[PDB]
Design a protein around this ligand. Structure first.
Ligand SMILES: [Mg+2]
Ligand SMILES: [Zn+2]
Lengths: 163, 620, 49, 1061, 46
DNA sequence: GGGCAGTCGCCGTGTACCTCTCCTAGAGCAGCATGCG
RNA sequence: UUCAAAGCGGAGAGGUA
DNA sequence: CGCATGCTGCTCTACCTCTCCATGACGGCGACTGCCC
């Protein structure tokens, strides 16, 4: 609800919603990072702050689509902020009707099940639900990232197998 | 240049399922259908001709051998026998061929009916309870309400309601032409075939354009599902099964216990139940039995196929010999002990061993001690190659006999085989990347692995019962990469924070503290002047000064004392402009408005030892 | 131990695809780093951060 | 030490089963009648005519059979109308018998039935608090066997009832359906307006509609019936065959609710329900005499042992038998029948066999030494069929309750997933006939302890209103309590009172701990975690070649050894006339002869020796109760698990680092810490459809250089030394293919050697029973002697573990001011951070005892007599030893426990004196000969084609996913890919890699592993259309589906990698 | 006899707090202001 | 219709290694030991 | 010319780090 | 002197239904359900 408060304030004050989304996400990100680091430092444990920043940006990088103007985006879909922004810009450059959106906070388990590869998600949790949804949508997996080249037996795209 | 680029998934049509099985033969008929529930012959350990282990369908049991034994030899390639029609080829093809079972009555797939989202209910605009009642023969459904007033499309009737409607339709008095059809079976195929996705999508969009309230999310879900089916070019009625496939027989094998008893799988029981019920229902349909028994058979067949696909999801679990559930097809893939997490994301490997660890001092970091009984086993192919090339033996069999006989030359070869070959060591709960490291092995005598004391905190190891696992790399790339990226002598800092990770920890810090401390008693030889540090060390080594005495040494360099007085003291302006400033721990003597002439430091022989050791290590 | 292991597995699966592919995105945004202090006392100095 | 028989739970339970446990179940089922009521079967279950066992205990052990008896019950068949009575005796089953030590012998293995701690039957009240609502109270009524009942109070003041797991319903329906008018339920209740509110809100019910509604709610979908509801209630609560409170359930109900119902009636009645409702109302209204219950209290928990569990199994089998009898009796119209031909004992035999062989309450015995054996029979478990489950047990069940005091040990538990779920009975505790644990106390009158008045046993609930003092309080003449303030316990709290106001005193200071923890001297100077470690590790020691008593024992050693039944004491008070390694004879004063036979080099469940040796000589005067022979883990009378060795506390040159141990070479050539281990091998000759199997020495493809030690019958000879890969028994099977036999004779597994000591063999046509289809059985026993070596685990009694890392020649060890080299050097870094201060006390007292030849005994908690008793005693003993010996270097006043030590390599003394003493150390069962394994290539799994797992079958090491993550973090790509494919399941790349390595070429690129193809087939079999595709190069071409299951290279692909030649 | 009421003056956090923070769950505290303003009347009513 | 409290059911809960035990019911059919006149 | 006869799945109980 | 009957080993196949096998775990999230406007 802190995210909603910030988004509403910045939408009432600022004009464009892109900057409101960015500022709201920035403030929530800072709060989360500081809270986790404080909890760890209460004991005698020290970790660098990049390690927590990498994890936290995986939770605050999506948006919920509302009233898509003319793109192929029904309400209720979760999409990356950058993709939505680029599509809206390229569509409204000619003068079309843009789409609305609202930032969301996901979590560490709900975000791992929203990946674009069904092989990674089926091997984590809830295999039958993921496989049924993928079968209905007719999804295809292009084998990018770890945990999918390991299953087939290929060189991982990191390290000495980068190129 | 790779074989494939991506993986795609979709719904299976009956044509595809029949095409997976149903291979052809150089005759006028196809073979790939399972028709009888027999698995194996009791008298002789052979499979039957039409069953879960048949040889006409799944391939021969013994390579280049036919069922009747008439054919043999690898000369016979791609030619089928005549007395029994079994193709002659390798037996490995047995874990490829599939086959299929043809159902006498359609059944519904339980994944698409009983799910957290149910897709049949969403597509048909009906609640899950109504669809579940129409299936399993609990109610009826109206397919055509034509020429009536109180009947609507997709309305659930009942036995008494159907009887009372029959009392009017069968009178045929008037106003009831165009007999309405009701059907107490599934009839889901007819309801799903009646779908007209394009105009349904158009109507749904037209309705969703106007008015929202707060509960248009249902229409949004329906539109999403309809659009998925339109885009994929699938048919919804494929969610109701008409044929099913059968897994190849080596993935459900028969194993023999010690006492001669058989331990068959759980899939064979489920397949047997399905086949038996299907055959019984077909037989009943042939004789034109009363319908009230045919419906019971159909319901039982539905429950059997459902229990094969997924056990205990909708109804009651099927128990086997004991009161324990049987393992279905979904249990193979879904769990923590399923295929994904047990066989694909982690496996068992060759050229590996395990043993207890003890402490080895006098080892250098990047070295480990490997027992002589494990090395001769993990390094066998390299030993054989070296025996063949140098010390010309002959063939591989002679080399293996030489190893078995325990010739003295074996250890001489092994010692030069293993030098320059790194080895990877691992401990059980690998919590970070420093739980696996590479070392260079040294052959030791005994049955325990020797570990350097300076790597214990990284492994979190301890010498009270811990055990370690050993793996070896085979190819040139693995060896170069283990030497250049994982060797234990290049792991100084930690990746979580840049603090050092290889420091003297327990008994070395105590020794350094004792050596470099101070002692008010036991101060023989205090106040003696030495030239350079080596003289002081030589005077201490042959007992003439204590380890804790206070001595003056001549040292031109940089000093760092504790409890120091940064302000100069006892400045004595001597003759000729020479000034000798005397501090608490130094005796610098400086020239007149110039540079430094000499310096002396008051210290302890143990401190001289410590600092000389560090400087010698750095300069050499 | 079970709670710690489950948490680590979830963390690994959420963030497995973060690999370094680019040299520079060319931006001008960042955050403000300051010392971590409990009012009068400081807990983590700015130089360590 | 007032200690009675330590293993008495098992004996009492089995005696109860034999006396009145089988009778009660046999007589509760006897009158079996058919539906016409013409024939009756009566089981006069009072005689049982038990037949004597056909085999002794030793014969059963050595034959690998079962020790049991046969049960025969007399029955009579009565025909109505026409008078016809037939009498006979029917065979019921085989009952395994309990040996003299409290254990069972099933299929030649020793087994023990574990005791189970469960919740007692009765009525339990609880108060639950809503998020925003008031406090609401519920009550649960739980029987021994049957349906459960639940009452609940709502937020508006309404009373609801739940039966089993049906829907909730107002209490008025249940009370009217039971047959109670308004006036009596108004009078019995104490506050009738509270129930009057429910009456008004829910409407008055008459009997007819009460049963109507009860039937409607219990069994929906059926037409209601009055008789239906009546029968449903009668079957639910009032049927002896379907409902049972038990004796304990009736006792608890009467005790809590204050009723007066008879003890013989064991089913629910109306007064119990009325009283439960009244108690709930009073608890809601805060009457004053009502209180909620605690479920972890030891007054609400019970113990079940072998008698009750066997009774339940017998009951189930008897129900099945009655079903069979009723089905079979009516199939014949004409009688032509006898009671023998009517009963079938198969279901009862099957039930008993399943209970004793395949249950999870019957467990394989722990038999490493007598202490482990003794403590395995006194164990209490909270898991099993009728208790808890591992995923459901939480923080509250694994804790220590204040009611465990003197009944369950607070120290001895496992570490890991089983911590707090298995416990051990305390030293003085005993279980009464209801199933509750008791403990003894002495009475205190006017501050005087009456140590001559028969201590009283009291349960947890009884001793809550009394003020009970601990067992360490000091009295002056076994009389008045000294001091002015005394610690007491009142209502589970610790307070202090004047010693004219205490009521009871505990018997002994060790009443709170178990038997394993009672053997640790100077325990009050140790931490609790290390005490747990030491008590657990004392039960993993190995019996040694020549045992030896401790010098600083605690006083309980002679009692912990008398229960294993391996020490022989003379009952005679006479003379000894014949002594031998296998026989002893003692003659009384004209009182005949007593002869004993001794077991020699037998084998335990864990492959350890079970020898027995005599102590006495011929013509010796012997008194009654004197030890005559002793076992393999006892010195004269008492337990002896370790040895006394010289120890010094100091660091060596890095060999003591982090729990490692440095020892001397004297412990190897003096045969200290050497043990005997015996193994058993078995081969079976069966018959096949192709033909039978023959045991003979005519083995094909073998030379006479490998048949030296066979006895021209195909079986090895006694006294032969067998190394690895040696034939023991030669067998040939009739293969089908000239010579048609194949060789699969059994050989010793890799890594085993020793002497052959026994070749006992059994066959048909000789009176031996064999499994079906088999002709003969051959068993071979092989023994070996193992010495201490680098990699073995050593331990002490105070929790100090270690692994041996070096064995120094005796001229390198540090030595004393008399020239004696030390035996072991221990690191002092491990003492202060773990707080084992008692080991130093033990070392110093052992030093004094060795110098005096004294063998002291110290009991735990010894500071009630002085301020610092242990230090003063140790200092006085050391000073006395110094004065008696005459050597001044023994004891110094400046550094009491420290003396000077020299360097054996250079001869120079160390800078400061160190602590030396005599320590009692033990050798554990974790030896490095059983932990080393290696593999290059071997068998593979059938489905996945991955290497097998297991030391006994040439298995591989698992590379889990955490190691995969670690290799991914390093940037490794080629090591990982080589591990995943070429070394695991790339069926064609394995042979190519091996041949390339042998030939010296480069290893070729891998392919797709087999597990991925297996997964694709499994997913296709679920009606999923999954495939792999290759993208199209040009624009409008279609993507092409790639066929994985088709090798393109027509080259050899064997199942296992093979060497080319 | 009685049940006295009093106010005591009285924190460390561990794994549950970290799991709750990383999974973005809903705790039960911390009423949050929604609009800027500049005055906070406590309004101790009757 | 709108809006619920309240309730029912499914998902999830550390890694590596070692030792021991046991593993489908019922019915049908054929050949050998036992008490009696 | 051929290889070739030693490997098997599940459930329960306990232990070491 | 010989004749009639119970016990044991092997073989061969087929499966559904209950009085339900339990009613001491805890959190999260989605889909029915009765009740009050
Ligand atoms: Mg350890
Ligand atoms: Zn043929």
């Amino acid at each position: 609800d802190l995210l909603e408060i910030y988004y509403d304030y910045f939408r009432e004050q600022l004009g464009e919603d892109y900057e409101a989304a960015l500022e709201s996400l920035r403030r929530v990100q800072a709060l989360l990072v500081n809270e986790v680091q404080s909890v760890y430092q209460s004991q005698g444990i020290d970790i660098s702050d990049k390690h927590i920043e990498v994890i936290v940006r995986q939770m605050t990088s999506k948006v919920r689509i509302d009233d898509g103007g003319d793109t192929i985006m029904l309400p209720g879909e979760l999409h990356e902020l950058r993709e939505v922004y680029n599509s809206n810009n390229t569509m409204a450059l000619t003068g079309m009707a843009p789409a609305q959106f609202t930032p969301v906070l996901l979590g560490i388990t709900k975000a791992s099940l929203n990946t674009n590869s069904f092989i990674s998600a089926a091997s984590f949790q809830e295999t039958t639900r993921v496989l049924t949804e993928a079968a209905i949508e007719g999804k295809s997996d292009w084998l990018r990232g770890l945990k999918e080249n390991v299953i087939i037996g290929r060189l991982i795209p990191a390290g000495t197998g980068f190129k | 240049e790779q074989r494939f680029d991506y993986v795609k998934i979709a719904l299976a049509s009956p044509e595809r399922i029949r095409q997976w099985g149903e291979r052809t033969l150089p005759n006028g008929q196809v073979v790939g259908e399972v028709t009888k529930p027999e698995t194996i012959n009791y008298r002789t350990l052979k499979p039957e001709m039409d069953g879960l282990f048949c040889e006409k369908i799944f391939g021969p049991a013994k390579d280049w051998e036919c069922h009747c034994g008439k054919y043999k030899r690898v000369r016979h390639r791609g030619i089928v026998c005549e007395r029994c029609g079994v193709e002659v080829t390798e037996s490995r093809v047995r874990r490829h061929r599939m086959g299929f079972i043809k159902l006498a009555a359609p059944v519904a797939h339980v994944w698409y009916l009983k799910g957290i989202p149910s897709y049949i209910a969403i597509l048909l605009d009906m609640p899950l309870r109504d669809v579940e009642q129409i299936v399993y023969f609990n109610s009826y459904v109206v397919l055509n309400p034509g020429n009536h007033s109180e009947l609507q499309y997709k309305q659930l009737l009942n036995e008494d309601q159907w009887m009372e409607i029959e009392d009017q339709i069968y009178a045929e008095e008037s106003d009831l032409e165009g007999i309405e059809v009701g059907i107490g079976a599934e009839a889901l195929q007819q309801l799903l075939q009646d779908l007209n996705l394009n105009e349904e999508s158009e109507k749904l969009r037209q309705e969703i354009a106007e008015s929202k309230g707060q509960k248009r999310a249902k229409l949004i879900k329906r539109l999403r599902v309809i659009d998925n089916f339109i885009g994929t070019e699938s048919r919804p009625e494929w969610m109701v099964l008409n044929v099913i496939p059968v897994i190849p027989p080596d993935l459900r094998p028969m194993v023999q216990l010690d006492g001669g008893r058989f331990a068959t799988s759980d899939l064979n029981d489920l397949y047997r139940r399905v086949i038996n019920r299907n055959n019984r229902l077909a037989r009943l349909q042939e004789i034109l039995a009363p319908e009230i028994i045919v419906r019971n058979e159909k319901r039982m067949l539905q429950e059997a196929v459902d229990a094969l696909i997924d056990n205990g999801r909708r109804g009651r679990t099927v128990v086997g010999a004991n009161n324990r559930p049987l393992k279905s097809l979904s249990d193979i893939i879904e769990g923590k002990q399923g295929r994904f997490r047990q066989n694909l994301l982690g496996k068992r490997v060759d050229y590996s061993g395990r043993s207890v660890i003890v402490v080895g001092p006098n080892l250098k970091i990047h070295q480990c001690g490997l027992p002589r009984e494990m090395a001769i086993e993990l390094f066998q192919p390299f030993v054989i190659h070296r025996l063949i090339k140098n010390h010309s033996i002959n063939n591989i069999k002679q080399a293996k006999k030489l190893i078995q006989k325990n010739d003295p030359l074996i250890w001489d070869v092994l010692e030069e085989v293993i030098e320059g070959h790194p080895v990877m060591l691992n401990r059980a709960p690998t919590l970070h990347r420093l739980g696996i490291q590479a070392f260079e092995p040294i052959l030791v005598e005994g049955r325990a692995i020797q570990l350097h004391p300076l790597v214990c905190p990284a492994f979190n190891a301890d010498f009270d019962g811990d055990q370690m696992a050993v793996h070896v790399p085979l190819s040139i790339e693995a060896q170069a990469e283990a030497r250049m990226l994982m060797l234990a002598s290049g792991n100084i800092l930690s990746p979580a924070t840049g603090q050092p990770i290889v420091t003297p920890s327990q008994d070395m810090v105590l020794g350094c503290y004792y050596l470099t401390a101070e002692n008010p008693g036991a101060q023989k030889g205090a106040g003696r002047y030495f030239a350079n540090l080596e003289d002081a060390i030589r005077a201490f080594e042959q007992g003439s000064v204590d380890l804790h005495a206070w001595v003056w040494v001549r040292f031109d360099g940089e000093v760092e004392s504790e409890g120091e007085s940064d302000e100069p003291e006892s400045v004595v302006a001597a003759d000729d402009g020479t000034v000798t400033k005397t501090y608490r721990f130094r005796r610098i003597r400086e020239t007149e408005d110039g540079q430094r002439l000499s310096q002396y430091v008051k210290t302890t022989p143990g401190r001289i030892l410590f600092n000389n050791t560090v400087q010698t290590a750095l300069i050499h | 131990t079970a709670d710690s292991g489950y948490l680590t597995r979830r963390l690994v699966d959420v963030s497995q695809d973060v690999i370094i592919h680019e040299v520079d995105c060319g931006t001008s945004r960042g955050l403000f780093v300051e010392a971590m202090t409990d009012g009068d006392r400081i807990l983590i100095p700015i130089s360590q951060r | 030490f007032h200690l009675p028989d330590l293993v008495a739970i098992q004996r009492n339970s089995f005696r109860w089963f034999l006396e009145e446990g089988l009778i009660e179940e046999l007589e509760s089922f006897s009158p079996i009648t058919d539906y016409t009521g013409k024939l009756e079967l009566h089981f006069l279950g009072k005689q049982y005519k038990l037949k004597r066992p056909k085999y002794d205990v030793d014969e059963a052990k050595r034959r690998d059979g079962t020790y049991s008896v046969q049960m025969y019950v007399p029955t009579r068949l009565i025909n109505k109308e026409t008078g016809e009575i037939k009498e006979q005796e029917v065979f019921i089953g085989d009952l395994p018998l309990m040996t003299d030590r409290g254990t069972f012998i099933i299929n030649g293995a020793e087994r023990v039935i574990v005791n189970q701690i469960v919740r007692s039957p009765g009525v339990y009240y609880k108060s639950e608090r809503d998020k925003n609502g008031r406090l609401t109270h519920n009550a649960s009524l739980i029987p021994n066997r049957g349906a459960w009942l639940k009452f609940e109070t709502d937020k508006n003041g309404l009373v609801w009832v739940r039966i089993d797991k049906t829907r909730k319903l107002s209490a008025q329906v249940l009370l009217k359906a039971l047959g109670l008018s308004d006036n009596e339920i108004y009078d019995k209740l104490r506050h009738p307006e509270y129930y009057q509110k429910t009456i008004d809100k829910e409407g008055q019910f008459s009997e007819d509609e009460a049963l109507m509604e009860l039937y409607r709610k219990l069994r929906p979908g059926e037409p209601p019936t009055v008789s239906g509801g009546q029968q449903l209630l009668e079957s639910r609560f009032f049927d002896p065959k379907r409902y049972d409170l038990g004796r304990v359930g009736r006792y608890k109900l009467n005790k809590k609710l204050g009723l007066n119902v008879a003890d013989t009636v064991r089913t629910l009645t109306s007064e119990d329900i009325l009283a439960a409702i009244d108690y709930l109302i009073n608890l809601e209204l805060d009457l004053g005499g009502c209180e909620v219950d605690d479920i972890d209290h030891l007054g609400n928990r019970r113990v079940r042992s072998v008698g009750e569990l066997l009774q339940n199994q017998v009951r189930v089998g008897l129900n099945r038998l009655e079903r069979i009898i009723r089905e079979r009796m009516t199939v014949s119209d004409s009688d032509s029948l006898s009671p023998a031909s009517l009963v079938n004992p198969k279901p009862l035999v099957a039930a008993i066999k399943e209970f004793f062989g395949s249950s999870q309450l019957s467990q394989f015995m722990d038999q490493t030494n007598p202490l482990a054996e003794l403590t395995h029979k006194r164990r209490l478990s909270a898991l099993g069929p009728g208790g808890l489950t591992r995923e459901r047990a939480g923080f509250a069940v694994r804790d220590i309750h204040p009611s465990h005091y003197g009944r369950i040990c607070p120290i001895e538990t496992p570490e890991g997933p089983n911590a707090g779920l298995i416990g051990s009975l305390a030293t003085h505790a005993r279980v009464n006939d209801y199933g509750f644990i008791e403990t003894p106390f002495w009475r205190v009158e006017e501050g005087r302890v009456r140590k001559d008045l028969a201590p009283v046993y009291m349960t947890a609930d009884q001793e809550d209103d009394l003020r009970v003092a601990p067992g360490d309080v000091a009295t002056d003449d076994a009389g008045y309590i000294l001091g002015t303030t005394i610690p007491v316990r009142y209502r589970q709290d610790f307070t202090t009172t004047t010693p004219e106001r205490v009521d009871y005193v505990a018997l002994s200071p060790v009443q709170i701990i178990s038997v394993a923890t009672s053997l640790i001297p100077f325990l009050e100077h140790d931490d609790a975690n290390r005490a747990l470690m030491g008590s657990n590790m004392q039960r993993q020691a190995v019996p040694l070649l020549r045992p030896e008593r401790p010098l600083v024992g605690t006083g309980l050693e002679p009692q912990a050894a008398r229960d294993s039944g391996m020490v022989i004491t003379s009952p005679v008070d006479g003379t000894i006339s014949y002594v031998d390694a296998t026989h002893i004879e003692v003659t009384a004063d004209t009182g005949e002869k007593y002869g004993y036979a001794l077991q020699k080099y037998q084998r335990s469940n864990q492959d350890t020796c079970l020898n027995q040796r005599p102590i006495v000589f011929e013509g010796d005067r012997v008194q009654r109760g004197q030890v005559i022979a002793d076992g393999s883990a006892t010195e004269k009378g008492e337990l002896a698990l370790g040895q006394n060795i010289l120890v010094a506390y100091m660091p060596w040159e890095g060999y003591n680092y982090e729990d490692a141990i440095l020892i001397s070479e004297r412990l190897v050539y003096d045969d200290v810490y050497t043990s005997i281990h015996i193994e058993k091998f078995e081969i079976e000759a069966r018959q096949t459809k192709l033909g039978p199997e023959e045991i003979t020495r005519e083995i094909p493809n073998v030379g006479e250089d490998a048949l030296r030690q066979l006895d021209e019958n195909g079986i090895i000879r006694v006294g032969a030394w067998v190394e690895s890969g040696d034939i023991l028994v030669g067998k040939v099977t009739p293969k089908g293919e000239a010579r048609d036999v194949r060789d699969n004779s059994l050989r010793v597994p890799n890594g085993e050697k020793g002497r052959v000591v026994d070749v006992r063999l059994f066959t048909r046509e000789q009176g031996d029973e064999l499994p079906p289809g088999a002709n003969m059985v051959v068993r071979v026993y092989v023994a070996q002697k193992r010495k201490i070596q680098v990699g073995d685990k050593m331990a002490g009694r105070h929790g100090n573990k270690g692994i041996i890392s070096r064995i120094l020649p005796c001229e390198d060890m540090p030595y004393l001011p008399d020239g004696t080299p030390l035996d072991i050097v221990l690191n002092p870094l491990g003492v202060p951070s773990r707080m084992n201060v008692g080991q130093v006390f033990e070392c110093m007292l052992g030093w004094a005892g060795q110098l005096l030849d004294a063998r002291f005994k110290v009991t735990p908690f010894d500071e009630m007599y002085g301020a610092e008793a242990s230090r003063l005693t140790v200092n006085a003993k050391l000073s006395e030893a110094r004065e008696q010996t005459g050597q001044p270097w023994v004891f110094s006043d400046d550094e009491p426990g420290k003396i000077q030590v020299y360097d054996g390599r250079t001869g120079e003394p160390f800078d400061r004196p160190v602590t030396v003493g005599r320590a009692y150390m033990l050798k554990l069962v974790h030896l490095v000969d059983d932990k080393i394994h290696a593999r290059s290539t071997g068998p593979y799994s059938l489905v996945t084609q991955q290497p097998l797992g297991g030391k006994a079958q040439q298995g591989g090491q698992r590379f889990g996913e955490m190691e995969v993550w670690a290799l991914e973090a390093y940037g490794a790509a080629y090591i990982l890919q080589e591990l995943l494919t070429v070394k695991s399941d790339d069926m064609q790349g394995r042979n190519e890699a091996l041949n390339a390595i042998v030939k010296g070429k480069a290893i070729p690129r891998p392919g797709t592993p087999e597990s991925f193809k297996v997964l694709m087939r499994e997913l296709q079999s679920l009606c999923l259309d999954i495939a792999v595709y290759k993208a199209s190069t040009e624009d409008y071409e279609e993507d092409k589906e790639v066929d994985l299951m088709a090798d393109v290279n027509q080259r050899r692909t064997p199942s296992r990698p093979t060497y080319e030649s | 006899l009685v049940l006295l009421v009093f106010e005591r003056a009285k924190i460390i956090q561990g794994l549950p707090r970290i799991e709750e923070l990383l999974e973005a769950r809903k705790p039960k505290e911390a009423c949050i202001l929604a609009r800027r303003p500049g005055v906070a009347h406590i309004n101790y009513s009757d």
